[PDB]
Design a protein around this ligand. Structure first.
Ligand SMILES: [Cl-]
Ligand SMILES: [Cl-]
Ligand SMILES: [Zn+2]
Ligand SMILES: [Zn+2]
Ligand SMILES: [Zn+2]
Length: 261
C-alpha cells in the first residue's frame, strides 16, 4: 500500500488549455499506484522518453519496472524498484475528442466529490528506487533477484513448493513464469485461496486484507497485504498453472498471528 496518484485528461484543465502540449507529472514511490484516464498503449507498455522525435522506443512495464502490476487503468508500482526510472504515457486530445468530452462533462451540474485547440497530453512519471527485495517467490527462469525466493537461487524453492512466512501488516507475493496464457489457481487468487485443501474465501480468515492482481492471466505478479491483525495462524496456497510442466509451482504462505504497531 502507498499513495494513489491520478492523471485524468478528461478534465477541463487539459481540454480547454491554450497550449498544444498539456502535462501531468507524478513523483511516485515503490508500491504506489497510478490511475491513467485518457479519453482517446499503457500501462502494459510505456514510452522511455518524453520527446516524440528521439527515443521513440517503448518498453513493457514489466521489463522497465519488474514486479509491477497492471489492472484496468491502474498501475501498481513494484514494491522494489532498483533504479530511479522515468517513463511517459501520451494522450491524443484531438478536437473531436475534446468536443465529445466537453459535452459529456455537462452531466456534472456542480463540483461535488465523486466517492478549442488540438493537444498532446503527456503523463510524466518519476519512480524512486529503494533497497528492499520483494518478500515472495519468483517462478520465472531468470537471474533478476527482485524476490527473496527466486527459483534460480538453490534452496529457495524445493519440490516446486515455495514456502513464505508472512506477519501482520506485511506485503507478500509471487510471480509466475511469464507466458501469454498461464493461469493461477484458484482463478481468483488472492480473493479465493487454498486452505486445508479446499478453495476458501480469504476474507473468512484474514478480513481487512488487500490485494494487487491482474484477473485475466498470470502475466503479472500477485500481491497480498496482510492486515494489521491476524487472529490465528493460517497456511494458504496459490498455484501457477501452465501447459508447460516446468512452470507448475506452488506458492505456500505461512500467515502468522499478531497485532503490529
Ligand atoms: Cl487489465
Ligand atoms: Cl484486472
Ligand atoms: Zn483487467
Ligand atoms: Zn450536489
Ligand atoms: Zn490497519
Amino acid at each position: 500500500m502507498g499513495k494513489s496518484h491520478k492523471c485524468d485528461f478528461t478534465k477541463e484543465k487539459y481540454l480547454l488549455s491554450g497550449e498544444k502540449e498539456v502535462s501531468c507529472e507524478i513523483d511516485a514511490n515503490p508500491a504506489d499506484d497510478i490511475t491513467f484516464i485518457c479519453p482517446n498503449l499503457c500501462f502494459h507498455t510505456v514510452n522511455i522518453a518524453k520527446n516524440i522525435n528521439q527515443n521513440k522506443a517503448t518498453m513493457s512495464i514489466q521489463d522497465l519496472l519488474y514486479g509491477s502490476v497492471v489492472y484496468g487503468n491502474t498501475l501498481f508500482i513494484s514494491p522494489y524498484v532498483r533504479t530511479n526510472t522515468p517513463f511517459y504515457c501520451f494522450c491524443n486530445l484531438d478536437t473531436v475528442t475534446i468536443q465529445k468530452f466537453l459535452k459529456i462533462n455537462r452531466f456534472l451540474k456542480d463540483d461535488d466529490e465523486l466517492s478549442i485547440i488540438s493537444k498532446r497530453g503527456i503523463m510524466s512519471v518519476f519512480v524512486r528506487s529503494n533497497n528492499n527485495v520483494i518478500k515472495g517467490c519468483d517462478f520465472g527462469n531468470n537471474n533478476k533477484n527482485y524476490f527473496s525466493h527466486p527459483i534460480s537461487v538453490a534452496g529457495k524453492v524445493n519440490n516446486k513448493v515455495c514456502k513464505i512466512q508472512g506477519k501482520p501488516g506485511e506485503l507478500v507475493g509471487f510471480k509466475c513464469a511469464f507466458e501469454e496464457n498461464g493461469k493461477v489457481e484458484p482463478p481468483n487468487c488472492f480473493d479465493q485461496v487454498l486452505h486445508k485443501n479446499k478453495v476458501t474465501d480469504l476474507k473468512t480468515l484474514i478480513p481487512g486484507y488487500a490485494s494487487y492482481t491482474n484477473k485475466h492471466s498470470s502475466k503479472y505478479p500477485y500481491y497480498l497485504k496482510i492486515p494489521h491483525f491476524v487472529n490465528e495462524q493460517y497456511t494458504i496456497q496459490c498455484k501457477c498453472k501452465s501447459n508447460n510442466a516446468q512452470n507448475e509451482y506452488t506458492f505456500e504462505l505461512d500467515i502468522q498471528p499478531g497485532e503490529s504497531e
